[PDB]
Amino acid sequence: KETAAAKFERQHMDSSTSAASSSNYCNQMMKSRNLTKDRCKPVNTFVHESLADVQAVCSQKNVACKNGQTNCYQSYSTMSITDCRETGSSKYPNCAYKTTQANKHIIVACEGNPYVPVHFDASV
């Protein structure tokens, strides 16, 4: 019974590294965060900021979600992130990813009491 908040933290939070660090990072992290268990998740973003700083985005700039819901929020600051994208050669179960580091505004969807991130929508 993983909570929606905990699923967001597993899939999207990595405060321990300042920036993607290594060319190995997406290969290791997509596997260790269990995002390659059932299929190769094609894309995924990790955020290298404190949990409190990501949770605070839920009270920042309200923006439309890609799915048309209204509960998305854009960070006023830029944040350190790593984008993981499956290589063309990647075949499950040997899921392979390119690691790219960026500093961008994040967009998250927030739900619940407490009102916390449950989904990573985009970076801009």
UniProtKB/Swiss-Prot annotation:
GO terms for molecular function: lyase activity; nucleic acid binding; ribonuclease A activity; RNA nuclease activity. The keyword Lyase applies. It catalyses: an [RNA] containing cytidine + H2O = an [RNA]-3'-cytidine-3'-phosphate + a 5'-hydroxy-ribonucleotide-3'-[RNA]; an [RNA] containing uridine + H2O = an [RNA]-3'-uridine-3'-phosphate + a 5'-hydroxy-ribonucleotide-3'-[RNA]. It is found in: Secreted. Keywords: Disulfide bond, Endonuclease, Glycation, Glycoprotein, Hydrolase, Lyase, Nuclease, Secreted, Signal. Glycans are attached at residues 1, 7, 34, 37, 41. The active site is at residues 12, 119. Disulfide bonds join 26-84, 40-95, 58-110, 65-72. Its main location: secreted. Substrate binds at residues 7, 10, 41-45, 66, 85. One of its GO terms (biological process) is defense response to Gram-positive bacterium. GO terms for cellular component: extracellular region. Pancreas. Changing residue 119 to A: Loss of activity. It is an enzyme of class 4 (lyase). Interacts with and forms tight 1:1 complexes with RNH1. Dimerization of two such complexes may occur. Interaction with RNH1 inhibits this protein. Monomer. Endonuclease that catalyzes the cleavage of RNA on the 3' side of pyrimidine nucleotides. Acts on single-stranded and double-stranded RNA. Belongs to the pancreatic ribonuclease family. This is Ribonuclease pancreatic. The gene is RNASE1.
